């Protein structure tokens, strides 16, 4: 659930 | 009192090119961000790795210098994220930024349509964006469908788009005497974007 579907 | 075809109309009326020709005009797997890749199982498609705080672009294999050229972009609405931009670029345009940005259009080397914002960017550090299609009111937006067409006329020096079968008007002018590649910039993890070249005239 990151803004642009990316891995932290 | 009768119907005349545009060169664009005539191009769209010819049968689209073979797969071989589509592949020759497809995404260049050796001219891309390190954070994207062309899919081996479908070479018309590139896929973006889920990299946080990163904007990533990729150029088509062919930089157009003359003629009219039309390709289809398929980009599922749900895989667009905050910054989904489609356009053209020179060979010198940057294919990556830190952060989420309108990478295509943020410099002198690229010209882009931001699909979410319905706005055009070129030399963004120094020049204002423009509403596109231009009939839209300041605060009026529509969702660009999954597939649509991009039309680059290197003889007129113009870039235009076709959406839902309708001509959206000229987006960018002033493109004569350049060498311009298809381009997109993306920020969405695992987003896939297809470019299918349709045809060219000249």
Author numbering:
A (entry chain B): 1 to 8
B (entry chain A): 30 to 231
Tell me what the authors wrote about this structure, in their words.
The SPRY domain- and SOCS box-containing proteins, SPSB1 to SPSB4 (also known as SSB-1 to -4), contain a protein interaction domain known as the SPRY domain, which was first identified as a sequence repeat in the dual-specificity kinase splA and ryanodine receptors, together with a C-terminal SOCS box motif.
However, the longer Glu68 side chain of hPar-4 reorients the backbone to replace this bond with the somewhat unfavorable 3.3-Å juxtaposition of the Glu68 β-carbon with the hPar-4 Asn72 carbonyl. At the N-terminus, the hPar-4 residue Asn67 makes no contact with hSPSB1. To the C-terminus of the NNN motif, the introduction of a proline residue (Pro74) also induces a main-chain shift; in VASA, the preceding residue, Asn189, makes both main-chain amide and carbonyl hydrogen bonds to the hSPSB1 backbone, but in hPar-4, only the amide bond can form.
